[PDB]
């Protein structure tokens, strides 16, 4: 088989035969930030290093054209003082663009073209400085890494709650900080064929969770049990305990989206429960206690379940009794 | 004496820019680096962003592409451009080694031009695959800058009385031409494929084929280089090892050569009787404009074949002469210029030039093979359609018997149209053999004089011998087949019935004359075998005789100076590349008469 | 593949097979020496058997004679092993069980008795002889470069490794292409065989368009197999030529360096380049 | 005709006869970032270049008033050392404001006014540096360019699904990264006249899509089919196949809004399907397949449709049978 979403939230889909490369070229910045860190470091390094080299040749060339490279006598004021070779020009380019300015190699007022290049390099230097420094901070401050500290259960549980079967799972937050405006979306991913004969390979049917005022809103500070009540209009209304084997083509996806309180950027944590990762005769064990004047959450027992008496019939059969 | 772009002579007086900057040789050479760094700084950000950024989960494969107008010309010019720059780098290094200091301006600008020229090809190909005609402006700017900055250097040579005697003057002149023509090509695509200036971006007109028709034979669609290296097949073979191939992975045939489009032109040419003479006129008209292309590649490959021995002759003479004295004897502006004669004097230069000469030769002969074969099987499909059409409708009032002869028709499309196809496989080979032979013997005569004439004559006289034993070998199999058929017929009387023949226990005496029926065929095998063994030592051992009749003849009847290693190996190399193109000459003559019978057989059976 | 080829030496015996190995190896070794002495003689020509160097010619005169006898030594033995294979199969055919013959299709035996033996007789000894001289000459050509310059062999081995991979990927693909070309050959001529008989049952009854177009399906399947087989060969040769051309440049550059690095060599270098 | 929204999401509306230019003047920063790139480069260049010139005249003037420009003798400590002409003053302004500081031209402690200008230039130099560099990064990191990699179908489909006619379309995401909190809004744009006689030239009627838990929420990692079920209260309840010609005045708009996971800025992808761009008797072909242990999406067959047996009657007539 294959997993639509990995247990860690990675999506196992490969996009193939794209014939619209122009769209990717028209969207450059998103490409720049989406690069892996070894490529981001290379681009960050090569953006400044090539910029210094490009103007280093310009500084070297105009010093050549002005006769500054020739050591013949003196009495001539160079475009840039103390420039002898390309290495001097390259060092001067670094001083100007990074705004170090040692002053041993200084621009003089003899060559208006040199003053023109000094204006151009500073303007170009600022734009490269602005984009690249901002780009690498966006790369660092991405909110998807915050999703690594949002943990779901390794197993999902279907059991009787208030007389109806409920597909339950537990989601917790390890960090002290909060997830502002957290929303939970649960979907069923399987191949469904309509009566007209249309087949959808990964038809994602959105299932609701019981919240009391609708859904898609939680206050995640202690590990919550997120459960969906299986009723007449639920896609799992005809799910039997015999169906919960490895090769079933039945996947449940849980999505947790919210604004990271520490950073301010919305994140997304995903997980998936295959058919064999759902336990029928089980129930989660409480892990919240009260020590002194502060509730203590025991994350060691996060995913533990305890068998409970549950009917081996489908939710359809339960209504029919 | 550290690294210096302009070299450290006098008091670095070569860096002075008085009397004009453009009159300073180094500055103009430095000015020529501007276009090359421009191309690198433009294409690399573009190539990385659109092509080298997303990977391993985002596939942007284009299984459809249209070549820009002038695609073939652009690749030809770049290959010439790449070759000339290699000469310019080699020319610069020879001039630089004489001085005590290293003048980087002699070769580094040309060396960096080599990277930019390659990058332009890489940049163009990726753009061309994914359209993006607007991005061709970067090349358009690059060619204009390169043309401007190379014109300046060429003009300043003319001002400084630098004639054609100096090689660097010639190489710079060619680059102006090559940059100029490439500039025109970029202008050409703007006219044909208006995309920037005109307000009507003319329709790309996507190819009729190359859609999702299952075409896997991408040879007529890939770029020019991939046509000469078959790089498209590399991916196909890379997976053929993992999975066995089938008639589905092999795909469908391209539209231009399926079967019908070959026959459609065949019957069109037939419009002009339908005799043997009339058949050849149609085939020449239908499949001649492509056949000459294969011969032309073969001719050029044959011409570059002599570049092997010539480089061998050149390298040894300038290596065994010792001396090791190198002096350009031509110094302008304090810079040494090497003459054309002196440039083709260094062993390293000859070795590099030989390496480039082989690559063009090896590719050309391979290109000659495929075009002939592709055209050969194109005729085979058209001929089979004509043969089948002859048997089928439009053949009213069949003469008599069982459609003339059932057996004759079966082999007519089995082992008679193949001979016609194999004639076109070797059609350039017969044409290109005399050209290689006449130049080969002439070059031998200019190396070893009289002794080479005798050695070449006996090899030429071997060609009738090879055909003579070919007729004997062919006749031996013909006599063998008469006895083998009787042996097969006698054996195939209860062999298929051996499931029930063995039950009667009559096979004990049946398998007693098998040796007799085989010895009557083995004695014909002996006649066939001895002819084969005769051709072996008349082919494998004949180069040894050719060498001896040329070597010992230098004093037996020539009486000349002692032979040098250069003249000996050059003639040895010429003999080696001449003996091998002789077996095909006997084969093509045998194939020529065989095909002539087959086409006559088809012509007489056409009506 | 070729693992079962360790057998078949019984037909060639021991004395006969060893004679071919000794003769074939001798011819290539002498030719190496013949060219080697030519280089030394030419080197000695420009300045002790320097007198008219007929000894080297005499050594060259025996090689062709030794090559002449080798041509028939490997050819005469090939005929006898065909006789022994013919004799061995005949004894098995007579003693072949009838029940096994009934169970088997009994048609493959007839094809193996006639078609396979015919290929073994007139083709295999020639192909094996050509293979032996080619696979030995390259090794000899891979030693003269070592003699002219022991420095070239440092990078020669990695190039041969790349040659091994290219060859390994070609034989697998080419043979499968050969099968498909053989596979598509049968329907094309069989349809023509079905065309010559019952044509009046096709012309009168049917429009004949389907049958003619059905052939185009056969020809296209045949043509694609042919050019794909051709393209694989052209793919193989080109990568082989580029490896060979690269070898020349490495050999030439190394040989030139030795002469200019006071390593003598002189005209001996020109021998290796050829 | 005219299109309310182009196929690429461009809105074809021109605002005319605006007599409230004071509102645009009161909102300057949004104007600054909304400029096209050639204007943004000009403003970015002219903001620094004019700043250097403005203080260059000030540095030149106070050096004039102090007598520094006069080469008469020495023994006088200038306001700024080594200032001779306006070019020297202009170079000094660049050194101070870009914080290069070569040191050949250095502020001295003789002129308190010169020290005052040095304080003023640095404070002004920082504000211009802060606003302009931040402005050009916002211009680069705009989320609208991310919408260029959110492809929609070139044709919509109205087929039979589960016994009811459904207006279907396919939306996909080319990038590997996700669109967090993706929402889909579909609207019908046509001229509707109320019974009272009021006419609305572009009355945008919002239509719902079937999601199962309400709507306006998708998990877009694989190309989804977004469809609206045509029922009694739907605006297309009286749509006939004869009405799907070019000159019909019936436009469907699809809006996809979500936070870009890579960047963190909400984006918006728009598309429109005119009457003739909607195919009646069609159905999208599945493109999602399973290769090894990873689903493969074949974007070559993205917009392809296959004819299916569909009634040629309106959804109103379907209920009436
Ligand atoms: C006597 C001598 C003594 C010598 C002693 C030696 C002395 C050695 C001297 C100095 C250097 C040691 C410096 C110490 C520096 C720390 C830098 C701090 C900034 C920094 O953060 O850099 C770090 C460290 O790497 C570097 O150092 C990269 C730093 C940039 C390198 C720029 C070099 C410029 C190259 C120019 C050279 C060529 C110039 C040519 C010159 C000629 C031109 C004419 C980058 O590391 P990282 O942790 O951010 O990246 C990982 C990694 O890339 C993973 O692939 C990535 O996985 P994914 O993103 O999920 O795919 C991880 O992501 P997760 O967070 O999810 O795990 C990242 O966390
Ligand atoms: C011997 C000598 C040798 C000489 C050799 C030559 C040597 C030449 C020397 C040095 C320069 C070459 C520098 C190489 C630089 C790259 C800069 C990198 C920063 C950068 O990103 O700049 C780039 C390149 O343009 C520039 O270069 C613009 C750079 C800023 C220019 C500032 C110049 C300052 C003017 C002051 C002069 C006047 C001063 C007066 C002085 C006297 C005062 C007293 C801007 O290009 P872009 O790609 O961002 O802009 C496009 C374009 O604008 C499209 O219109 C836009 O369409 P929409 O936005 O949709 O409307 C595209 O948007 P999409 O993304 O959707 O497609 C943009 O992508
Ligand atoms: C003295 C020597 C001077 C050497 C330096 C030269 C300094 C001089 C400086 C700059 C000028 C030389 C400029 C090159 C000139 C002309 C290019 C004009 C072509 C152009 O417009 O560029 C874009 C690509 O966008 C980029 O990637 C553009 C990306 C930026 C391009 C410039 C790269 C900037 C970084 C380079 C500097 C690197 C510095 C360090 C890196 C800094 C990083 C911040 C065209 O490409 P496209 O793919 O967008 O257009 C296609 C194509 O045209 C289709 O036919 C068309 O139809 P459909 O595909 O069916 O829809 C579509 O057209 P649309 O674009 O309208 O949708 C697009 O699909
Ligand atoms: C002395 C010798 C003198 C003469 C020498 C002549 C050598 C000429 C070599 C020129 C090679 C350029 C050929 C075009 C390369 C090119 O286009 O690469 C492009 C390739 C990707 O392939 P694709 O077909 O686009 O793939 C389809 C895929 N679906 C896609 O669109 O993606 O992916 C790439 O982008 C690959 C880039 C590789 C660039 C390598 C350049 C050459 C390197 C140096 C070798 C030559 C110099 C040797 C000196 C000795
Ligand atoms: C490494 C060396 C690279 C060498 C590249 C050689 C390429 C082989 C040539 C080759 O295969 O051409 C074959 C092509 C294909 O013709 P077609 O099917 O009719 O297609 C065009 C279209 N249908 C039309 O005719 O409309 O035929 C054509 O379309 C025309 C081909 C013309 C080829 C001319 C070759 C000259 C090369 C000169 C190079 C000299 C310098 C080389 C130095 C570098 C060496 C490394
Ligand atoms: C370098 C490899 C880059 C590459 O693989 O280039 C890929 C292209 C393939 O040809 P194509 O784009 O026409 O095929 C259509 C694909 N859409 O170019 C070539 O292979 C030209 C041949 C490369 C030269 C190699 C010669 C030495 C080895
Ligand atoms: C400079 O070098 C040149 C050699 O090209 C020669 O005229 C002399 O050695 C030097 N002349 C002067 C004036 O320095
Ligand atoms: K300083
Ligand atoms: K600073
Ligand atoms: K500073
Ligand atoms: K200082």
Q: What is the 3 state secondary structure string of chain D? A: CCCCECCCCCECCCCCCCCCHHHHHCCHHHHHHHCCHHHHHHHHHHHHHHHHHHHHHHHHHHHHHCCCCCCCCCCCCCCECCCCCHHHHHHHHHHHHCCCCCCCCCECCCCHHHHHHHHHHHHHHHHHHHHHHHHHHHHHCCCHHHHHHEEECCCEEEEEECCEEEEEEEEEECCCCCEEEEEEEEEEEEEEECCCCCEEEEEEEEECCCCCCCCCCECCCCCEEEEEECCCCCCCCCCCHHHCCCCCCCEEEEEEEEEECCCCCEEEEEEEECCCCEECCCCECCCEEEECCEEEEEHHHCCCECCCCCCCCCHHHHHHC
- Resolution, given in Å to one decimal, reads 3.3
The size of chain A, in residues, is 321
Q: Pick the closest to residue B90 from B293, B352, B330 (CA basis).
A: B352
Helix (H, G, I), strand (E, B) or coil at B539: coil
Residue D110 makes CB contacts below 8 A (sequence gap 6+) with D66, D77, D78, D79
The strand pairing partners of A178, in sequence order, are none
Q: Do B58 and D300 touch (CB under 8 A)?
A: no
Q: How far is B14 from chain A (nearest CA, A)?
A: 8
Q: Measured between alpha carbons, how far is residue B138 from residues B13, B42, B142, B147, C199 in Å?
A: 37, 7, 6, 14, 65
The angle that helices B33-50 and A37-65 make with each other, rounded to 10 degrees, is 160
CB burial of D71-87 (b: ≥16 within 10 Å; e: otherwise) equals eeeeeeebbbebbeebb
CA torsion sign, B379 to B382 to B386 to B392? positive
How many Cβ atoms are within 10 Å of B432's Cβ, its own excluded? 24
Instruction: Determine contact, residues D218/D183, Cβ cutoff 8 Å.
Output: yes
d(CA D83, CA D70): 10
Interrupted backbone of chain A, residues before each interruption (C–N > 2.5 Å) = none
| C-beta of residue C173 within 8 angstroms of C-beta of residue C232 | yes
Q: Render the burial of A161-200: b for 16+ CB within 10 Å, e for the rest.
A: eeeebbbbbbbbbeeeebbeebbbbbbbbbebebeeebeb
Question: Residue A236 is encoded by which pair of tokens?
Answer: 């799992």
Chain C residues 253-272 within an 8 A CB cutoff of chain B? 253, 256, 259-260, 266-271
Instruction: Label the pairing between strands A150-152 and A164-173.
Output: antiparallel
Residues of A in contact with B37 (CB under 8 A): 54, 57
Of A21, A39, A72, the CB nearest to B130: A21
Give the list of residues 6+ apart from residue B46 with CB closer than 8 angstroms, or none. Answer: A25, B123, B135, B138
CA distance A63 to A57: 10
Report chain D's C-alpha Rg in angstroms. 31
Residue A54: its chain B contacts at CB < 8 A? 37, 41
d(CA B145, CA B133): 20
Which D-chain residues 5-64 have CB contacts (< 8 A) with chain A? 44-45, 48-49, 52
Quick one: tokens of B417?
């149209």
For residue A266, the surrounding DSSP H or E stretch is strand A266-273
**Beta pairing partners, A289:** A296
A288 touches chain D (CB under 8 A): no
Contacts of C72 in chain B (CB under 8 A): 530, 533, 537
SS3 string, A122-158, reads HHHHHHHHHHHHHHHHHHHCCHHHHHHHEEECCCEEE
β-strands D251-260, A179-193 pairing: unpaired
Residue B375: CB atoms within 10 Å: 25
Query: Do the beta carbons of residue B4 and residue B102 sit within 8 Å?
Result: yes
Name the token pair of A26. Answer: 């028209």
If 0-12 CB within 10 Å is exposed, 13-18 middle and 19+ buried, where does residue C107 land?
Answer: exposed
B7, burial (CB in 10 Å: exposed 0-12, middle 13-18, buried 19+): buried
Question: Ligand 1 — pocket residues by CB below 6 A?
Answer: A 36-38, 41, 45, 145
Let me know: does B408 contact C268? Beta carbons within 8 Å: no
Order of strands, sheet of D266-273, starting from the edge strand that comes earlier in the sequence: D199-207, D179-193, D251-260, D266-273
Residues 6+ apart with CB under 8 A from D282: D155, D157, D159, D305, D306, D307, D308
Cα A125 → chain centroid: 30
Rounded distance between C-alpha atoms, residue A127 and residue A118, angstroms: 14
CA distance A188 to D213: 12
B278 lines ligand 6 (CB under 6 A): no
Q: Inter-chain contact B5–A24, Cβ cutoff 8 Å? A: no
CB distance D159 to D282 below 8 Å: yes
| Chain D contact probe: residue of B58, B61, B242 with most D CBs at under 10 A | B58
Q: Does residue C226 sit in helix, strand or coil?
A: helix
* A303 close to A317: Cβ distance less than 8 angstroms: no
Of A99, A183, A199, the CB nearest to D99: A99
Q: What is the distance between the alpha carbons of residues A52 and A95, in angstroms, rounded to a whole number?
A: 9
How far apart are the two ends of chain C, measured CA to CA in Å? Answer: 35
**DSSP notation for B462-498:** HHHHHHHHHHHHHHHHHHHHHHHHHHHHHHTTTSTTH
Q: Evaluate: CB of B222 within 6 angstroms of ligand 6.
A: yes
Nearest to B153 by CA among B333, B3, B342: B333
Interatomic CA distance for residues B353 and B90, integer angstroms? 10
Give residues (CB < 6 A) around ligand 5. B 72, 76, 79-80, 82-83, 220, 224-225, 227-228, 356, 359-360, 363, 367
Atom of ligand 4 nearest to the CA of B226: 13
- What is the nearest CA distance from A225 to chain D, expressed in angstroms? 19
* Residue A41 contacts B where some CB pair is shorter than 8 Å: no
For chain D, what's the residue count? 321
DSSP 8-state assignment for residue B209: S
- Tell me the DSSP string of B568-603: HHHHHHHHHHHHHHHHHHHHHHHHHHHHHHHHHHHH
Encode burial over B392-413: b for 16+ CB neighbours within 10 A, e otherwise: beeeeeeeeeebeeeeebbebb
Q: How many CA atoms lie within 13 A of B265 on its CB side?
A: 20
- Look at the block and give the residue holding tokens 């057996």: B407
Question: For a substitution probing ligand 7, which of B7, B10, B26, B333 has the most ligand atoms within 8 Å of its CB?
Answer: B10
Q: Across the interface, which of A5, A29, A143 has its CB nearest the CB of D264?
A: A143
Residues 6 or more apart whose CB falls under 8 angstroms from that of D83 comprise D59, D60, D63, D68, D69, D89, D92, D105
| List of residues 6+ apart from A314 with CB closer than 8 A | A237, A238, A239, A240
CA dist B215 and B249 (Å) reads 9
Number of Cβ within 10 Å of residue B102's Cβ equals 18
d(CA A310, CA A168): 14
The ligand 3 atom nearest the CA atom of A28? 27
Nearest CA to A110 among A66, A61, A154? A66
CB contact under 8 A, A16 and B57: no
Q: Show which subunits contact C, needing at least 3 CB pairs below 8 angstroms.
A: B
Q: Report CA dihedral (A86, A90, A91, A92) to the nearest 10 degrees.
A: 100
The residues pairing with A290 across neighbouring beta strands, listed in sequence order, are A295
Q: Determine how β-strand D266-273 pairs with β-strand D164-173.
A: unpaired
C274: nearest CB among B497, B563, B569: B569
> Is residue D12 part of an annotated ligand binding site?
no
Per the DSSP assignment, residues forming a β-bridge with A173 are A150
In B288-427 the beta strands, taken as DSSP E runs, fall at: 331-332, 335-336
Strand partners, A172: A151
Distance CA C263, CA C149 (A): 10
Contact A302, A223 (CB under 8 A): yes
d(CA B487, CA C110): 12
DSSP state, residue A239 = -
Tell me if residue C13 falls in helix, strand or coil. coil
Give yes or no for a contact between B462 and B569, defined as CB atoms under 8 angstroms apart.
Answer: no
H-run or E-run covering A186 = strand A179-193
Q: Is the dihedral of CA C48, C53, C54, C56 positive or negative?
A: positive
Cβ(B115)–Cβ(B36) under 8 Å? yes
Atom of ligand 3 nearest to the CA of B49: 27
Contacts of B310 (CB under 8 A, 6+ apart): B443, B570
Helix (H, G, I), strand (E, B) or coil at A313: coil
Task: Pull the structure tokens for residue A4.
Answer: 């639509």
Asked if the C-beta of D175 comes within 8 angstroms of chain B's C-beta atoms, the answer is yes
B4 vs A85: CB contact, 8 Å cut-off?
yes
Name residue, tokens 């045998």.
B590
Determine which of B27, B54, B56 to mutate to test the interface with A (most A C-beta atoms within 10 Å).
Answer: B54
Q: Between the CA atoms of B468, B473, B479 and B485, what dihedral angle is there, to the nearest 10 degrees?
A: -150
B219 token code pair: 């040879």
Hey, whose CA ends up nearest to atom 18 of ligand 6? B226
Residue A6 DSSP code: -
**Residue where the block lists tokens 């009559």:** B506
Atom 8 in ligand 7: residue holding the nearest Cα: B10
Distance from CA of B459 to the nearest CA of C (A): 16
CA distance B196 to B190: 8
* Subunit partners of chain A (3 or more CB pairs within 8 A): B, D
Calculate how far, in angstroms, residue B429's C-alpha sits from the geometric centre of ligand 9: 74
Q: Which residues contact B336 (CB under 8 A, 6 or more apart)?
A: B95, B98, B99, B328, B330
Which chains would you list as touching B if contact means 3+ CB atom pairs under 8 Å? A, C, D
Torsion of CA A33, A34, A37, A38, to 10 degrees: -100
Closest-CA distance of chain A to residue B68, Å: 17
Note the residue count of chain C: 274
User: Quick one: which of D187, D168, D175, D176 has its CA closest to D148?
Assistant: D175
DSSP annotation of C5 reads: G
User: Residue A11: its chain D contacts at CB < 8 A?
Assistant: 178, 221
Question: Residue B48's closest CA among C52, A35, C171, C84?
Answer: A35
The dihedral through the CA atoms of C174, C175, C179, C182 has a sign that is positive
What residues 61-80 of chain A have any CB closer than 8 A to a CB of chain B?
Answer: 61, 64-67, 69-72
CA C60 centroid distance within chain: 26
CA–centroid distance, residue B122 to ligand 4 (Å):
6
- Distance, in Å, from the CA atom of D212 to the CA atom of D215, rounded to the nearest integer, reads 7
- Is residue B300 within 8 Å of B554, Cβ to Cβ? no
CA atoms within 13 A on the CB side of B78: 24
């Amino acid at each position: 088989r294959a997993r639509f979403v990995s247990k860690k939230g990675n999506c196992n889909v490969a996009h193939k035969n794209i014939r619209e490369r122009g769209r990717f070229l028209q969207d450059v910045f998103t490409t720049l930030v989406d690069l892996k860190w070894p490529h981001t470091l290379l681009i960050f390094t090569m953006s400044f290093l090539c910029s210094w080299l490009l103007f280093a040749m310009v500084w070297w060339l105009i010093a050549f054209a002005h006769g500054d490279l020739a050591p013949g006598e003196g009495t001539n004021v160079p475009c840039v003082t103390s420039i002898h070779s390309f290495s001097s020009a390259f060092l001067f380019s670094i001083e100007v663009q990074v705004t170090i300015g040692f002053g041993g190699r200084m621009v003089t007022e003899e060559c208006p073209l040199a003053i023109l290049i000094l204006i151009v390099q500073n303007i170009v230097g600022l734009m490269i400085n602005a984009i690249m420094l901002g780009c690498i901070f966006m790369k660092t401050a991405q909110a998807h890494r915050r999703a690594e500290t949002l943990i779901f259960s390794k197993h999902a549980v279907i059991t009787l709650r208030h007389g109806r079967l409920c597909f339950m799972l537990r989601v917790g937050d390890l960090r002290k900080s909060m997830i502002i405006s957290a929303t939970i979306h649960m979907q069923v991913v399987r191949k469904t064929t309509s009566p007209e004969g249309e087949v959808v390979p990964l038809h994602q049917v959105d299932i609701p969770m019981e919240n009391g005022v609708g859904g898609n809103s939680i206050f995640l500070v202690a590990p919550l049990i997120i459960y969906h009540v299986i009723d007449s209009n639920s896609p799992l209304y005809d799910l039997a305990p015999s169906d919960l084997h490895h090769h079933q083509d039945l996947e449940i996806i849980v999505i947790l989206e919210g604004v990271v309180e520490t950073t301010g950027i919305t994140t997304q944590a995903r997980t998936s429960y295959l058919a064999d990762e759902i336990l029928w005769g089980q129930r989660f064990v409480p892990i919240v206690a009260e020590e002194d004047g502060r509730y203590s959450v025991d994350y060691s027992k996060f995913g533990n379940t305890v068998k409970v008496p549950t009917p081996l019939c489908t939710a359809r059969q339960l209504d029919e009794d | 004496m550290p690294l210096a772009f302009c070299g450290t002579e006098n008091h670095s007086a070569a860096y002075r820019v008085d009397q004009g900057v453009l009159n300073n040789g180094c500055f103009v050479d430095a000015l020529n680096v501007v276009p090359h760094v421009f191309l690198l700084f433009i294409t690399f950000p573009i190539l990385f962003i659109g092509w080298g950024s997303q990977s391993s989960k985002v596939h942007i494969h284009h299984s459809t592409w249209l070549h820009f107008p002038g695609h073939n010309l652009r690749w030809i010019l770049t290959f010439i451009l790449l070759f000339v720059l290699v000469c310019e780098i080699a020319e610069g290094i020879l001039s630089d080694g004489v001085t005590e200091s290293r003048h980087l301006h002699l070769y580094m600008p040309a060396g960096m031009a080599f990277m930019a020229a390659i990058t332009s090809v890489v940049y163009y190909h990726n753009i061309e695959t994914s359209n993006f005609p607007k991005l061709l402006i970067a090349l358009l700017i690059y060619w204009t800058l390169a043309f401007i900055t190379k014109t300046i250097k060429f003009v300043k040579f003319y001002d400084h009385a630098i004639g054609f005697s100096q090689l660097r003057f010639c190489l710079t002149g060619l680059l102006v031409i090559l940059y100029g023509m490439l500039l025109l090509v970029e202008v050409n695509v703007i006219r044909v494929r208006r995309y920037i200036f005109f307000k009507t971006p003319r329709e790309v007109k996507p190819p009729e084929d190359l859609q999702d028709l299952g075409v896997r034979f991408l040879q007529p669609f890939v770029n020019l280089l991939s046509k000469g290296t078959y790089w498209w097949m590399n991916a196909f073979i890379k997976t053929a090892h993992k999975k066995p191939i089938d008639l589905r992975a092999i795909g469908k045939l391209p539209i231009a050569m399926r079967a019908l489009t070959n026959y459609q032109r065949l019957c069109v040419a037939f419009d002009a009787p339908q005799g043997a003479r009339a058949i050849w006129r149609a085939l020449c008209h239908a499949f001649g404009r492509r056949l000459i292309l294969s011969s032309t590649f073969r001719i050029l490959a044959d011409l570059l074949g002599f570049a092997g021995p010539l480089c061998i002759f050149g390298i040894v003479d300038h290596l065994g002469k010792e001396n090791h004295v190198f002096q350009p004897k031509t110094q302008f502006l304090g810079v040494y210029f090497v003459s054309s004669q002196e440039f083709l004097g260094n062993a390293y230069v000859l070795a590099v030039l030989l390496f480039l000469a082989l690559l063009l030769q090896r590719t050309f002969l391979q290109a000659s093979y495929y075009v002939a074969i592709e055209t050969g099987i194109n005729l085979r499909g058209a001929i089979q359609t004509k043969i089948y059409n002859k048997i089928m409708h439009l053949s009213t009032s069949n003469l008599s018997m069982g459609e003339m002869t059932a057996g004759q028709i079966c082999n007519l499309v089995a082992i008679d149209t193949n001979q016609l196809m194999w004639f076109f496989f070797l059609c350039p080979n017969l044409w290109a053999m005399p050209v290689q032979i006449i130049v080969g013997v002439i070059l031998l005569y200019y190396i070893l004089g009289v002794s080479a004439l005798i050695g070449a004559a006996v090899i030429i006289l071997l060609a009738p011998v090879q055909y003579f034993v070919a007729t004997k070998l062919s006749q031996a199999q013909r006599s063998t087949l008469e006895h083998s058929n009787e042996r097969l017929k006698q054996t195939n009387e209860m062999l298929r019935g051996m499931k029930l023949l063995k039950l009667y226990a009559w096979e004990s005496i049946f398998c007693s004359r098998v040796e007799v029926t085989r010895r009557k065929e083995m004695t014909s095998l002996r006649a066939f075998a001895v002819y084969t063994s005769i051709s072996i030592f008349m082919n494998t051992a004949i180069p040894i005789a050719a060498v001896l009749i040329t070597f010992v003849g230098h004093v037996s009847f020539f009486k000349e100076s002692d032979l040098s290693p250069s003249v000996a190996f050059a003639s040895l190399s010429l003999f080696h590349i001449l003996v091998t193109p002789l077996f095909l000459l006997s084969s093509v003559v045998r194939s020529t008469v065989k095909a002539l019978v087959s086409v006559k057989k088809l012509s007489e059976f056409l009506s | 593949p070729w693992r079962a080829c360790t057998k078949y030496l019984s037909s060639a015996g021991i004395l006969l097979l060893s004679l071919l190995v000794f003769s074939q190896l001798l011819k290539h070794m002498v030719l190496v020496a013949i060219d080697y002495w030519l280089a030394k003689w030419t080197d000695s020509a420009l300045v002790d058997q320097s007198v008219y160097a007929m000894v080297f010619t005499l050594l060259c005169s025996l090689g062709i004679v030794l090559c002449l006898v080798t041509s028939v030594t490997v050819e005469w033995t090939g005929l006898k092993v065909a006789k022994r294979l013919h004799r061995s199969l005949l004894n098995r055919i007579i003693l072949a069980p009838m029940r096994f013959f009934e169970t088997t299709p009994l048609g493959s035996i007839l094809n193996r008795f006639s078609s396979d033996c015919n290929t073994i007789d007139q083709h295999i000894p020639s192909t094996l002889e050509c293979l032996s001289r080619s696979t030995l000459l390259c090794v000899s050509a891979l030693t003269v470069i070592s003699y002219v310059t022991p420095v070239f062999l440092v990078a020669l081995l990695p190039l041969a490794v790349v040659c091994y991979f290219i060859q390994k990927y070609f034989r697998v693909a080419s043979r499968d292409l050969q099968q498909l070309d053989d596979t598509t050959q049968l329907p094309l001529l069989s349809h023509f065989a079905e065309t010559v008989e019952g044509l009046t049952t096709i012309r009168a009854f049917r429009y004949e368009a389907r049958f003619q177009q059905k052939l185009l399906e056969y020809t296209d399947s045949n043509n694609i197999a042919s050019l794909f087989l051709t393209a694989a060969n052209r793919w193989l040769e080109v990568r082989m030529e580029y490896i060979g051309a690269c070898v020349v440049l490495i050999a030439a550059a190394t040989s030139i360096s030795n002469s200019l690095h006071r390593e003598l060599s002189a005209g001996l270098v020109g021998l290796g380049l050829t």
